[PDB]
Design a protein around this ligand. Structure first.
Ligand SMILES: CC(C)(COP(=O)(O)OP(=O)(O)OC[C@H]1O[C@@H](n2cnc3c(N)ncnc32)[C@H](O)[C@@H]1OP(=O)(O)O)[C@@H](O)C(=O)NCCC(=O)NCCS
Ligand SMILES: [Cl-]
Ligand SMILES: [Mg+2]
Lengths: 393, 303
């Protein structure tokens, strides 16, 4: 899922993590009153869109720049008037931009020292890990490439929790000194608790730094959430912003389908994550480009097959559909029925390459044979990939 | 140590199995299929339904009562994600030698806590979660894999993907090699059994003469497997190892269906895993459809 800057920073603030003071406004007058209530020396107005490059973006109103600094609350309201309800186009958006419904009115903070700090689950050490670097404000794996001595890690025991010696050592390795080191150590402990509380896969703060006035602040952050934990994080997943997503992926999300759009023209209908990845791989190895990844496993129901198939046929890029099922818990006849009925109330118009194996495959092939659909049956993975590639321009 | 439970991976005809989530939808169905296959399914658990019968077998309120009353040595878990971690923990608490968790969708943080207890005992061996299970062809099936494609043979198969296990099984059966033991370790980022655990069993098993290792993007288990093979599968009597790694074309930063299948921070890519495995003497099949033929050629060239 995705959160706006104001959503993740509010999540951090509500759990004792220090961020810049801010309000969110839905109208220009709301932004003006928010700027007045801030009582801040300098104010930053930020359009709320997920994509990056807001600083160099252009609004459909003609206003240049999605991030503006000013000391006058009336300027905040006037500039917000040229922001809200307009589209903001940046280097990372489609050329028609993204509609800005909300702006952030925040206290503008000066930054005198930047560090990197992230918290995630370490697969090798089977527990949470603190990953920090005193070289903040840049790409982290860039630092790891040229200065691996500047990456510091603290492995944390999940049952023991974060220890004060772990928080203090990381704050020291990040470069914080004296009272600012104690402040940073305490913020690391509150970032750790937040990380566990919200079932995050990663809380990444960059820059994790300090103001000239001697406050340790999380100036910007990104939080990735564990999708497996949505059932116990519904209040956070309710905040999900799907307005900048691939619209087909939004449709897939409505039906709990694992769909990832790609740039090819061969649609993939697969019942396993490994097989679907392998299907994309073998299409590429035989000269094709897959249009999507699709993992439809578990106790799949015919209605899920019906929707997924309609989803693939709604993609204008798709010139052919490769169905590849090795069913174990998946009953192949459920696949065959969902596809045949889908092609009834949809009028199939692209080549259909089908390969079925496993649970109840013989009954499933009989459903396809008696369907009269234009099907090209495949023999194995290689045959399926070559036949699908042969079906497209 | 937890590595002492590695031997519990090798189910056989004398393995006795209980089912956690026995009365549920998938627990009932695959319990039926296990009985029709010949698996010694002796009962199962569902909290609050102990004292009932299900498929002619006793239902119990706890794993411990089920274990004591049937002598079960293995448990398979069909428990929904919100409770499956507690179902694993109960089986560890009952000291069930082998636990197989099929459930997909367990919170990662839950499994981090499960692994904390798991790694500090040596009685219980956990396969999964998010896995198809384990099968000894013609002796014992614990999981969801289609039994009719299997054939008792001499290839050991370990895989992070259930569907790719079926591919390898079907191909090795078609060429006549068959399978000694198949272990699907699942596609989650935190689980109870990795490649090295299965490789240790395969190298010491006389019935296993060749190995198929199936991996994918994410983590470093394939890299750890390569290091294990460099140190323990050299020597004069090495066993041939064929591999396929999924996700050569996967985009970065996205979890590809599996919770553990993601390239992030310049780590987890399939190409590095292919290179690591090849440096350990593994013959990596470029195509997933050629696993059976690739290891067949290795058996032919080895006379
Ligand atoms: C585990 C899974 C299969 C369960 O789905 P399901 O069988 O349709 O669900 P159900 O609700 O019908 O059955 C679950 C049962 O477990 C029971 N249960 C709950 N907590 C339990 C516990 N601690 N111990 C034992 N049983 C428990 C429930 O009461 C329920 O039984 P009931 O209906 O008799 O009351 C599903 O969540 C899942 O993970 N599916 C995907 C699996 C997959 O594809 N894995 C990868 C293979 S490679
Ligand atoms: Cl070892
Ligand atoms: Mg799967």
């Amino acid at each position: 899922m995705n959160l706006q800057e104001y959503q993740s920073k509010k999540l951090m603030s509500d759990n004792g993590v220090k961020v810049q003071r801010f309000f969110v406004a839905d109208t220009a007058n709301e932004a003006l009153e928010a700027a007045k209530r801030l009582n801040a020396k300098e104010i930053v107005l930020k359009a709320q869109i997920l994509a990056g490059g807001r600083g160099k973006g252009v609004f459909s109103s003609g206003l240049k720049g999605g991030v503006h600094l000013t000391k006058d609350p009336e300027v905040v309201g006037q500039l917000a008037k040229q922001m809200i309800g307009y589209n903001l186009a940046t280097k990372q958006t489609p050329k028609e931009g993204v509609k800005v419904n909300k702006v952030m009115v925040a206290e503008a903070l000066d930054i005198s020292r930047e560090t990197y700090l992230a918290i995630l689950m370490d697969r090798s050490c089977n527990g949470p890990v603190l990953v920090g670097s005193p070289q903040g404000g840049v790409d982290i794996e860039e630092v790891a490439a040229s200065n691996p001595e500047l990456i510091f890690k603290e492995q944390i025991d999940i049952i023991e929790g974060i220890k004060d010696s772990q928080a203090q050592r990381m704050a020291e390795n990040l470069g914080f000194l004296g009272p600012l080191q104690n402040q940073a150590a305490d913020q690391i402990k509150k970032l750790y608790n937040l990380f566990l509380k919200i079932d995050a896969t990663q809380v990444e703060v960059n820059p994790f730094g300090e103001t000239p006035e001697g406050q340790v602040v999380c100036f910007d952050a990104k939080i990735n959430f564990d999708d497996n934990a949505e059932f116990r994080q519904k209040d956070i997943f309710a905040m999900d912003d799907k307005s900048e997503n691939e619209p087909i992926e939004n449709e897939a999300a409505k039906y709990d389908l694992k769909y990832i759009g790609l740039d090819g023209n061969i649609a993939c209908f697969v019942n396993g994550a490994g097989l679907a990845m392998a299907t994309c791989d073998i299409i590429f190895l035989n000269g094709g480009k897959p249009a999507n990844f699709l993992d439809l496993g578990g106790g799949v129901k015919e209605s899920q097959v019906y929707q997924a198939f309609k989803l693939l046929t709604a993609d204008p890029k798709v010139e052919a559909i490769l169905v590849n099922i090795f069913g174990g818990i998946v009953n192949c006849a459920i696949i065959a029925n969902g596809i045949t009925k889908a092609c009834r109330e949809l009028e199939l118009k692209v080549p259909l390459v089908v390969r079925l194996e496993g649970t109840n495959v013989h009954e499933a092939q009989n459903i396809l044979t008696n369907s009269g659909l234009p099907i090209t049956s495949a023999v194995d993975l290689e045959d399926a990939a070559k036949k699908a590639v042969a079906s497209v321009t | 140590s937890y590595t002492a439970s590695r031997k519990h991976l090798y189910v056989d005809k004398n393995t006795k199995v209980i089912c956690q989530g026995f009365t549920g939808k998938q627990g009932t169905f695959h319990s039926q299929q296990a009985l029709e296959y010949g698996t010694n399914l002796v009962g199962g658990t569902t909290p609050g339904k102990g004292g009932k019968t299900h498929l002619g077998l006793p239902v119990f309120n706890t794993v411990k009562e089920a274990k004591e009353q049937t002598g079960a040595t293995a448990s398979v878990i069909y428990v929904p994600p919100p409770f499956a971690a507690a179902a694993i923990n109960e089986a560890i608490d009952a000291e069930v030698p082998l636990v197989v968790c099929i459930t997909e969708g367990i919170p990662q943080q839950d499994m981090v806590r499960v692994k904390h207890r798991l790694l500090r005992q040596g009685k219980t061996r956990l396969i999964g979660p998010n896995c198809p299970g384990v099968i000894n062809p013609g002796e014992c099936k614990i999981g969801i894999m289609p039994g009719h494609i299997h054939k008792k043979g001499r290839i050991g198969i370990v895989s992070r993907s259930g569907t790719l296990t079926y591919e390898a099984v079907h191909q090795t059966t078609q060429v006549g090699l068959g399978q000694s033991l198949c272990v699907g370790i699942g596609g989650d980022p935190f689980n109870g059994t990795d490649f090295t655990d299965c490789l240790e069993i395969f190298l010491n098993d006389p019935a296993t003469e060749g190995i198929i290792l199936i991996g994918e993007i994410g983590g470093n288990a394939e890299e750890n497997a390569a290091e294990f093979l460099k140190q323990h599968n050299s020597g004069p009597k090495s066993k041939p190892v064929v591999s396929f790694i999924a996700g050569l074309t996967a985009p970065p930063g996205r979890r590809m269906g599996h919770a553990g299948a993601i390239i992030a921070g310049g780590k987890g890519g399939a190409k590095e895993k292919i290179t690591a495995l090849q440096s350990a003497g593994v013959v990596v099949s470029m195509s997933p459809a050629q696993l059976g033929t690739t290891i067949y050629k290795e058996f032919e060239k080895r006379k």
